[PDB]
Amino acid sequence: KTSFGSLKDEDRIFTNLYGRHDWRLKGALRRGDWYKTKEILLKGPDWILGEMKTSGLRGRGGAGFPTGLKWSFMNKPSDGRPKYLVVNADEGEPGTCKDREIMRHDPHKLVEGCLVGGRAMGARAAYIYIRGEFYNEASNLQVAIREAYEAGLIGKNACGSDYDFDVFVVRGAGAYICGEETALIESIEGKQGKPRLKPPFPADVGVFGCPTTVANVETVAVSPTICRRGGTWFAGFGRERNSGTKLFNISGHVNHPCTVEEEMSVPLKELIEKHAGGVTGGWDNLLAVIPGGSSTPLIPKSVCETVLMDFDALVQAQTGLGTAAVIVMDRSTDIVKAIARLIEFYKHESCGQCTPCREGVDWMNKVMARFVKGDARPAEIDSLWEISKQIEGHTICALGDGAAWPVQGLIRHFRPELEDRMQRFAQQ
Amino acid sequence: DTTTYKNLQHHDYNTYTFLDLNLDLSKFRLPQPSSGRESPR
Amino acid sequence: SNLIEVFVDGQSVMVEPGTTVLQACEKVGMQIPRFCYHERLSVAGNCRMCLVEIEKAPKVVAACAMPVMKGWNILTNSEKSKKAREGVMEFLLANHPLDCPICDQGGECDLQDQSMMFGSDRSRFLEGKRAVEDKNIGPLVKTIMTRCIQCTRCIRFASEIAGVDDLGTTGRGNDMQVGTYIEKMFMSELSGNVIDICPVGALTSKPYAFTARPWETRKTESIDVMDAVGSNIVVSTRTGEVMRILPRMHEDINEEWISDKTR
Amino acid sequence: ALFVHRDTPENNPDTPFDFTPENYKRIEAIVKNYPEGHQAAAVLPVLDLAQRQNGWLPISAMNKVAEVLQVPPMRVYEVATFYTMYNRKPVGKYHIQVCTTTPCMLRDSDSILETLQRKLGIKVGETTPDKLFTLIEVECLGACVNAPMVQINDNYYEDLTPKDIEEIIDELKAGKVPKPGPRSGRFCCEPAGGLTSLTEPPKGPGFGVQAG
Amino acid sequence: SGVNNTKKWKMEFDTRERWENPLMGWASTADPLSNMVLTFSAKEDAIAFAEKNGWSYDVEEKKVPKPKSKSYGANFSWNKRTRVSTK
Ligand SMILES: Cc1cc2nc3c(=O)[nH]c(=O)nc-3n(C[C@H](O)[C@H](O)[C@H](O)COP(=O)(O)O)c2cc1C
Ligand code: SF4
Ligand code: SF4
Ligand code: SF4
Ligand code: FES
Ligand code: FES
């Protein structure tokens, strides 16, 4: 119960995350899927949610909220409408590649986990929204679904079970905002990817005005083997409040950038050193790291040596975990340029319906460009902090938060570099 | 084995693969719901 | 019964379920500021100006859209909500163009009066504004879209009341442009009502263009004689002339709307 | 770029476009992909299909989609302006993309952009005079690990370098649309420095199974 | 959309002949009650003031907007016609 980050391959819940054995059915069936799914389904729905609540499985997307509670919001019967299950694969946040690398190389985990989630909840079918740029991955997935339909695992008798299910694959069109719970839903409905206000919640009224619970790829893909192996076993790894395995995408300024499944609450330094061998120039050459993709603030190397890769730890460090897409800077790169690029991205990917992210994100983009060039003065730094705090909790969706948090992470840990660039531009 | 890459079929996909497969899948899929209505107009 | 006890700055008020915070506060007398909600159109929380804290909840809520829950105190003049309004006005007036003396909704602008009550008095904006291409709808509605605040109070009217569905939003970000993607005469028998709907002067009337100003105008409550509907009307004069027509509010007839003839 | 339309001789409501008899089969399949009501959900796949049958989206296509779906055309215009994967102006045979977000700006993406500019003689957003290649700077694409990457007509070329995109382009010009993926020692997201995550066999069925 | 210019009963007079001044075109009058407006917190106060000062009055009753049932969830219905095609 102390200093545990390393593990073995019996626990690797993504046994083919590198496409080394097989992605089709014949080859996936060997890796422990579609095994006892009839027994799982007919065991009961509440048994599945009990396994979830005992596993302590938090949402492995951006906003980590405990599942079981989330999936139990539509255990109630239907008052004259069908129910649906939207699997989210608009993996648009920077640094995040894990959902791609499972979409290809292990689609059947996803399919059976989605079925299991539906029968745990109630669902006529499912809608696997996938990014528009993921054409070949989506086609691998469609082939897997076709093999499943042919083998008799889905449809009029889903592995028997006295329960009928379908699995659809909706295809996006290239917008990061369509990863949100509600923009995704409206895009499936056939409109712009503009989020809704929440309330209403998708479990009372969602896609097509019907109940839904949106879920990420791995959030469901780990469901069936959790049911198959218990919440005790999944909760045994990781701290008591945020447990389980975790895919970890690593990018930038490290010798061997990679995707890894690892034990949650592993230290960031253990993670970087074991897999994706040491950063360029070694640890001393480290400058800052972003643990999430881009909707999480910076880390200054002062709390990289004494921090666990968890929700609670990074929250204690005035930061947060999202999809856990580690990104590294190594003293050889302008950092304000990087964060200005992130804000340029968050400007391009805004929907625009709510005023703060419509305007203030463009404010911050322009101001951070001006800080890159050094054409500002330090009385604007706290002004821009105030602009961030205006944008934070004044929005419909959490893209304003994601735009405002890297800003705060830079102002909190790298203000003197802004000061230096300003005085340099002023002198010259 | 674990010696090479075996997601090899995607190196020869056309433009109309996803849609051809959704077409072939429409046969298997069940009847759908109905809002007692053809459109919101 | 099916009632709910709700508090507004402490003061209790009894409202049905399905209501909201704006209506609860209206039952007291407070109207919360707003740029998107109309009371005759579908709700769309797109201005984020109707933000009020609840006494112990950690964040603010859209008072136009959030339904009110049992056992709530709505704090309207609290520093959190005032900070929210000041920030929202900052963002709105950031790219807004300095066209107040040009603009025909000059002494009639909700943006002005809301900046004057519920907003700061200074710009900390030191960057270049935008400027949007204008649209030639028709001989009535004069679109100057460098000043639209993207409130969507017009698309909802055109879709839900006029039943047209020829008005939308193109793009995203600051570059989202309200209107058609094409040249199309938005030419309906309920089209001049957008001039009253749009709180901003992004679209005004062409006949009234540049003629008078609201403080100059005397206002006599008359009725219509074109049709036999009896649409209540306000005739606005200026030194013995007639300058424009406007609707009155009667819910049995002329539900804030009038035809394009009689205006 | 514009988000407004003005009727060119080329692009106009009478610019010719109607689906082929097979694309209509695909369309009715797509409409069976959603309930009987809410047939408007197929706007994205049907517009993408039109784009896939003509390369770009003329106004004629955006209105024929509405006619097929009996949706108003304005909603289709909204949808086509919002999402960026739709080409509202004509492009070349090979629509090239380059990520410049930080996880790929931070692994020499500007180098690839420069080499892709000079090798083609164009600026960033321009198209070639032969109407064969184009180029644009876009955001993330979900392969941030294999950082220096591109997308060339719904296929990925990743973990690449200047020589390994010059080779690519000269392979595209002679028709040999080459194999996608990492143009390096890798073949996937794995660490280039040998296996470090798993190298033993994956376990069979019935493994670690709870009672039931 | 503001309603504070309401809430107070006013008392106006009938309008009378205005005419173009033959020099400049200004608007002239022959009545002094033209620019006349009073304000009363209630209605009986106004009837009292008018009956007291000897004016025949016409009272227009108080027009209050109907309360209405708003719902942001009706915009995303499965069966109803409130399913708006936009957002
Ligand atoms: C702008 C924005 C983009 C998001 N994009 C994604 C995404 O691409 N993939 C994802 O899984 N979640 C994304 N989210 C978080 C989703 O709300 C979350 O994934 C979903 O609620 C499922 O949560 P879960 O992890 O419990 O399954 C995004 C949120 C915001 C505000
Ligand atoms: S924060 Fe940005 S993306 Fe989210 S609803 Fe508001 S404008 Fe749209
Ligand atoms: S709408 Fe007209 S009057 Fe109001 S702030 Fe804008 S320019 Fe000024
Ligand atoms: S034109 Fe007027 S009513 Fe329409 S969105 Fe813009 S500000 Fe709102
Ligand atoms: S009045 Fe509520 S967000 Fe506009
Ligand atoms: S940041 Fe470049 S592919 Fe994701």
Numbering used by the authors:
A (entry chain F): 9 to 436
B (entry chain s): 28 to 68
C (entry chain G): 6 to 268
D (entry chain E): 5 to 216
E (entry chain Q): 47 to 133
Tell me, in the authors' exact words, what the paper reports.
Mitochondrial complex I (NADH:ubiquinone oxidoreductase)1 is central to oxidative phosphorylation in mammalian cells. Mammalian complex I comprises 45 subunits: fourteen “core” subunits, which are conserved from bacteria to humans and sufficient for catalysis, and 31 “supernumerary” subunits, which are required for assembly, stability, regulation, or fulfil independent metabolic roles. The hydrophobic Q10 enters the enzyme from the mitochondrial inner membrane through a long binding channel, elevating its redox active headgroup out of the membrane plane to within electron-transfer distance of N2.
Here, we have used the canonical complex I inhibitor piericidin A1 (referred to hereon as piericidin for simplicity) to determine the structure of complex I with a ubiquinone-analogue inhibitor bound in its active site. Piericidin-inhibited complex I was prepared by adding piericidin to the enzyme during turnover with NADH and DQ to ensure exposure of the inhibitor-binding state. The piericidin headgroup binds adjacent to NDUFS2 His59 and Tyr108, the two proposed ligands of the ubiquinone headgroup. Because piericidin lacks a second carbonyl it cannot form a second ubiquinone-like hydrogen bond to His59. Instead, His59 Nδ1 forms a hydrogen bond (N–O distance 3.2 Å) with the piericidin 2′ methoxy. To accommodate the piericidin, His59 has shifted by ~2.5 Å; this is the only difference that could be identified between the piericidin-bound and active structures. In contrast, our piericidin-bound structure contains a reduced cluster N2, which does not lead to observable structural changes.
